């Protein structure tokens, strides 16, 4: 081996980082509009919750590529 | 053998992270408009869900390209 | 075998990731307008869908560059 | 083979990626305005499509750089 | 030498937690903007405002746990 | 240790840097809306300070990883 | 010999890509206003068309410097 | 080697750089709202300056990081 | 010579790249407002052209800096 | 020797950054200027001077490019 | 030596550059609100000036960290 | 001999360029609001020019960094 043993780790960190950044970018507008709707009605709490509960699939694939990289280490 | 492996790995990580970034900036506005629609009408649930759940094609090609590099490693 | 393999790999990663980011930026605004149109008129379904399924041309070319460098490896 | 061809490969990937980024940034706004115009008018469909089908020039130059440096490979 | 690997895995740690924090921060910006708007107008949606504020630190807890799993490399 | 310690230094500095980035981009909009609320009411002051004092948690975790690699010396 | 050729090549790629990104950033707003005028009037076709065309300059200088660097290659 | 020292220097410099730019983007909107409130009232100046001044945190952790690595140098 | 030709070419390319990027960001808003003015008045064409080609002058510094590196190349 | 190339890449990033900064300046400057011109057709001198203020970034970029060019 | 000198100089460059960028991004909105208030009021001059000229402190600490780096030589 | 000269050249260029960027972002909004104030009343000429000519300071310290590093030659 060599410097690759750490370069793979850099890949892990970069992958999870931009994954989290993408989910944050989505969740900002999603939860903002959801909060407005909830403050209006207080009846759509489940719908707003699930709508904010989609965009983290990105970070499960991010942890997925992280874990397969960890196994490949 | 050796030093190449970490370079392939950072390639994987940057590919999946950038794909996540793109789909995130998409689904931000997409789900914002969709949750507004489901707020004011309550009957556009299916249309809003398919409209929000279409643009993840990017991350499926992301795991495909990451998987083919994982096999090539 | 050496730097060349991981370096063509990171070339692949850059290509696919930036194509995905660009099209994410595209159908963000595209699908926002399309969802609004679907909400207010309900008859522009075909037009909204074609107008949203133009901008994956970028990712399919990006997959072509990924494939040709895959063959080059 | 050669390391140098390896760095040309990164050149290809980053070039087509930036080209896709630019044209997608264009298509977002123009297609959103065109979708609004189609929803309100429906008679300007040819104009809306052609105004969306100018921005593939930026990517076909990118594929032209791809083909010439691929010949250099 | 093997020391450089330790340094650049530490670099990986730092960039992981950094982008995780950046993403959750750009989330909390708009989230809390809408939250304190609703709070200043209503004062009674307070619990809802806090839970809506305290979802997206999932991002930083995966950031920290990936930090510890590279920390276990020693 | 030679270049290793400087690479740790780069790691800690960058980590706290983007931790500060995230907390700053949060507190911008947070304190803007809070200042508007305090301007029109002045009685929601405690709510304003608490809602502004959640988003430095990122700073404490960032300095936590910084202290961890400082312990790694 | 060798590595310098690939370095020139990645220079070519970043040149053409950045030129494309800048010009596409231009035609986004340019064509937005253009199709607004087109939808409202339909007699603004010539002026809107030349106005949308005019940012092709940046990419022809991009392929110009690409031509010079390819001739040096 | 002096690569260690140079790495410590770039780490501290980039750390204080991102810290300063984060507190800058915070203070932009913060002082904009403060100026609006002051122009409306002229008497909220204490609340305005404490709200505007509270983001000196990000920079003082930036400088204490810089001092820590300076002492380690 | 040797490798130095590669970095001087990289400098050429990125210089013209961000020169084009900056002037494109200028011409976007400039020509958007100009298109609005030409849609209204039809008599503002001379002012619109001088105001649009006025920020096109940023690319001549890019090409002359690239040229005086080309003389050394 | 080989130190000449990094001088050139410094040239390039300096001039490109200066050009991009003056571009994002003149965008808003000229937008407000053309709006005022389309409404007035008398604010021409004020508009042109307001637009010919912000290229100081590009002349300073050329000064830095030229001093490293003399050092090259 | 030389390598340490060059790389610490690079660190100086990032420190001052990002400090300048943060100060400017604050300066834009602060000054815009200031000139608006002055034009509508023409008596808010002192308050607008102290609020406007305040955030230069970031550039001052950037110069400070660059200067202690210079003295480290 | 070492390659420190090009690396300190990279440092000075990075510093001056980012200072130019920061003052560009400042001057954009400053001059936009200044022109907006001018178009309604011409007596606000002097204040607008002072407010536009404040933010040069950042590029002045950027060049100051440039020549203090230039003294190392």
């Amino acid at each position: 081996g060599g410097l690759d043993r750490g370069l793979i780790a850099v890949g892990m960190g970069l992958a999870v980082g931009l994954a989290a950044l993408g989910t944050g970018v989505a969740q900002a507008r999603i939860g903002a509009a959801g909060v407005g709707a909830i403050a209006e009605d207080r009846s759509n709490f489940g719908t707003a919750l699930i709508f904010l509960l989609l965009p983290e699939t990105l970070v499960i694939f991010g942890l997925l590529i992280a874990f397969i990289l960890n196994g490949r280490l | 053998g050796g030093l190449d492996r970490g370079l392939i790995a950072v390639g994987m990580g940057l590919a999946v992270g950038l794909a996540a970034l793109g789909t995130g900036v998409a689904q931000a506005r997409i789900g914002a408009a969709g949750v507004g629609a489901i707020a004011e009408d309550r009957s556009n649930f299916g249309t809003a869900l398919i409209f929000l759940l279409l643009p993840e094609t990017l991350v499926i090609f992301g795991l495909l390209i990451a998987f083919i590099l994982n096999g090539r490693l | 075998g050496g730097l060349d393999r991981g370096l063509i790999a990171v070339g692949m990663g850059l290509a696919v990731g930036l194509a995905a980011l660009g099209t994410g930026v595209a159908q963000a605004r595209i699908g926002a307008a399309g969802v609004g149109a679907i909400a207010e008129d309900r008859s522009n379904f075909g037009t909204a869908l074609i107008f949203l399924l133009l901008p994956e041309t970028l990712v399919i070319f990006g997959l072509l560059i990924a494939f040709i460098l895959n063959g080059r490896l | 083979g050669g390391l140098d061809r390896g760095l040309i490969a990164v050149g290809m990937g980053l070039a087509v990626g930036l080209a896709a980024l630019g044209t997608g940034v264009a298509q977002a706004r123009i297609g959103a305005a065109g979708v609004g115009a189609i929803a309100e008018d429906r008679s300007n469909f040819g104009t809306a499509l052609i105004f969306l089908l100018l921005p593939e020039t930026l990517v076909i130059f990118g594929l032209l750089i791809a083909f010439i440096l691929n010949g250099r490979l | 030498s093997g020391g450089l690997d330790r340094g650049l895995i530490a670099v990986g740690m730092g960039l992981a937690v950094g982008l995780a924090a950046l993403g959750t921060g750009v989330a909390q910006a708009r989230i809390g903007a809408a939250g304190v708007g609703a709070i200043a107008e209503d004062r009674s949606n307070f619990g809802t405002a806090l839970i809506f504020l305290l979802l997206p630190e999932t991002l930083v807890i995966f950031g920290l746990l990936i930090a510890f799993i590279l920390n276990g490399r020693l | 240790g030679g270049l290793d310690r400087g690479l740790i230094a780069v790691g800690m500095g960058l980590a706290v840097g983007l931790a500060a980035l995230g907390t700053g981009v949060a507190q911008a909009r947070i304190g803007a809306a809070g200042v508007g609320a305090i301007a029109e009411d002045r009685s929601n002051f405690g709510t304003a300070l608490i809602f502004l004092l959640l988003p430095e948690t990122l700073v404490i975790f960032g300095l936590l990883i910084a202290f961890i690699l400082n312990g790694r010396l | 010999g060798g590595l310098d050729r690939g370095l020139i090549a990645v220079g070519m790629g970043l040149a053409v890509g950045l030129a494309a990104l800048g010009t596409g950033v231009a035609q986004a707003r340019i064509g937005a206003a253009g199709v607004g005028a087109i939808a409202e009037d339909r007699s603004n076709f010539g002026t809107a068309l030349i106005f949308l065309l005019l940012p092709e300059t940046l990419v022809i200088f991009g392929l110009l410097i690409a031509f010079i660097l390819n001739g040096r290659l | 080697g002096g690569l260690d020292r140079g790495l410590i220097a770039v780490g501290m410099g980039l750390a204080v750089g991102l810290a300063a730019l984060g507190t800058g983007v915070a203070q932009a909107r913060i002082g904009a709202a403060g100026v609006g409130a002051i122009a409306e009232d002229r008497s909220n100046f204490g609340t305005a300056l404490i709200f505007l001044l509270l983001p000196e945190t990000l920079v003082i952790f930036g400088l204490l990081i810089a001092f820590i690595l300076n002492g380690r140098l | 010579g040797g490798l130095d030709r590669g970095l001087i070419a990289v400098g050429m390319g990125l210089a013209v790249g961000l020169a084009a990027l900056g002037t494109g960001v200028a011409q976007a808003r400039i020509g958007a407002a100009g298109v609005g003015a030409i849609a209204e008045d039809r008599s503002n064409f001379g002012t619109a052209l001088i105001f649009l080609l006025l920020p096109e002058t940023l690319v001549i510094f890019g090409l002359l800096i690239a040229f005086i590196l080309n003389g050394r190349l | 020797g080989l130190d000449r190339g990094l001088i050139a890449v410094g040239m390039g990033l300096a001039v490109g950054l200066a050009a991009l900064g003056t571009g994002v300046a003149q965008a808003r400057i000229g937008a407000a200027g053309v709006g005022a011109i389309a409404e007035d057709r008398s604010n021409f001198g004020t508009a042109l001077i307001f637009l010919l203020l912000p290229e100081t970034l590009v002349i300073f970029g050329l000064l830095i490019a030229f001093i490293l060019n003399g050092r090259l | 030596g030389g390598l340490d000198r060059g790389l610490i100089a690079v660190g100086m460059g990032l420190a001052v550059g990002l400090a300048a960028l943060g100060t400017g991004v604050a300066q834009a909105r602060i000054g815009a609100a200031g000139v608006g208030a002055i034009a509508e009021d023409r008596s808010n001059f002192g308050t607008a000036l102290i609020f406007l000229l305040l955030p230069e402190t970031l550039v001052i600490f950037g110069l400070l960290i660059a200067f202690i780096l210079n003295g480290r030589l | 001999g070492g390659l420190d000269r090009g690396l300190i050249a990279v440092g000075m260029g990075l510093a001056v360029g980012l200072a130019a960027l920061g003052t560009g972002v400042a001057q954009a909004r400053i001059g936009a609001a200044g022109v907006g104030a001018i178009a309604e009343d011409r007596s606000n000429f002097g204040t607008a020019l002072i407010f536009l000519l404040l933010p040069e300071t950042l590029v002045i310290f950027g060049l100051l960094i440039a020549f203090i590093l230039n003294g190392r030659l």
Binding site: - | - | - | - | - | - | - | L49, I50, L53, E56 | - | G45, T46, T56, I59, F60, L63, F66, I67 | S43, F45, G46, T47, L49, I50, L53, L54, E56, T57, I60, L63, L64, I68, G71 | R42, S43, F45, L49, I50, L53, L54, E56, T57, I60, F61, L63, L64, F67, I68, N70, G71
Partner: protein, 339 residues
């Protein structure tokens, strides 16, 4: 005279100090009984502009402009520019010609210390020179070689900064003591103690060779600072001291603008000299033409900011130390004939 804002405020000066009341007056009207900064700008402002520019040729062009304006005031008609919306009477022209007379005086003397004439001139005419190239006199401070002169120049710039700052703080403390504003004097003396502490600490951290009296010096300074903060019961003083630190180190801009402008002019004239030398006999005509034209474009580009930096340094810093802005005074206006 502590009967609130009652007294209208009018200002008067010795006859040489009247023109600067135009500069200081339009900001705000000071409270009655408050010290006025009207004599300080006459001595400081053209001095700083002189060390900034130092260009003899542009000083001569400014003298030509002053001759044009004095001819205008001699013919006694108003100067009007409808494009820029300025109408001004001849008396304001006279005040401005007094300003530019002092201005070119300081510019000329600082230029003869800074012998560069339209930039580099020693290559063509050896009246000036270097230890390298012989001449009639060497340049006293060669402000091109930043290897040795730069440290001295930042030293004088920071020295001007120190002097201006404790002068303002001493004025604030004097007013706080005299007007029974005793807490304001406490704030001022806390600023002085903290400031001497931080400057001593920075001098030790940068170039110390022995501890000596310095340790007791910053310890006394910080003790004075924390005591003055402590009994005053106001806790806003803590970040405000780093605000003062920024005001101390904000004074490098004069050296920075001077170096930038002089080196730009030197590069322009070096281009002219290279055009004259390379092309042979005929190259001097094109070289002089291009040198003159780029000299004119750069002057109308740069003379605004070079003028703005020192008066700005007087405006934001000094007037805020002693307390110019925080209240407005009632202006003086007599009930007299309109004429």
């Amino acid at each position: 005279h502590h009967e609130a804002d009652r007294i209208p405020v009018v200002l008067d000066n010795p006859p040489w100090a009247k023109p600067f009341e135009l500069l200081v007056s339009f900001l705000n009207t000071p409270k009655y009984g408050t010290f006025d900064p009207t004599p300080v700008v006459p001595v400081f402002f053209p001095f700083w502009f002189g060390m900034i520019v130092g260009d003899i040729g542009y000083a001569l062009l400014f003298y030509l402009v002053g001759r044009w304006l004095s001819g205008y005031v001699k013919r006694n008609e108003p100067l009007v520019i409808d494009l820029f919306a300025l109408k001004l009477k001849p008396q304001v022209i006279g005040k401005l010609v007094h300003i530019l007379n002092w201005m070119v005086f300081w510019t000329v003397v600082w230029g003869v210390i800074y012998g560069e004439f339209f930039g580099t001139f020693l290559e063509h005419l050896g009246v000036f020179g270097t230890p390298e190239h012989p001449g009639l006199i060497p340049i006293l401070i060669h402000r091109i070689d930043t290897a040795k002169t730069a440290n001295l120049l930042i030293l004088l710039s920071v020295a001007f900064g120190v002097v201006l700052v404790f002068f303002g703080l001493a004025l604030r403390a004097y007013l706080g003591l005299k007007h029974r504003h005793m807490a304001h004097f406490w704030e001022g003396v806390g600023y002085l103690g903290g400031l001497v502490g931080v400057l001593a600490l920075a001098a030790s951290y940068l170039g110390n060779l022995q501890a000596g009296w310095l340790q007791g010096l910053m310890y006394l300074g910080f003790g004075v600072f924390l005591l003055a903060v402590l009994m005053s019961r106001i806790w806003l003083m803590i970040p405000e001291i780093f605000t003062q630190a920024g005001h101390i180190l904000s004074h490098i801009r004069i050296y920075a603008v001077g170096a930038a402008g002089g080196i730009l002019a030197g590069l322009l004239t070096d281009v002219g000299f290279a055009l004259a030398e390379r092309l042979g006999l005929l190259g001097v005509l094109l070289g002089l033409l291009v040198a003159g034209v780029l000299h004119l474009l750069i002057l109308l580009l740069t003379t605004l900011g070079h003028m703005l930096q020192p008066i700005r340094l007087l405006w934001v810093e000094f007037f805020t130390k002693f307390g110019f802005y925080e209240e407005n005074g009632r202006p003086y206006r007599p009930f007299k004939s309109v004429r």
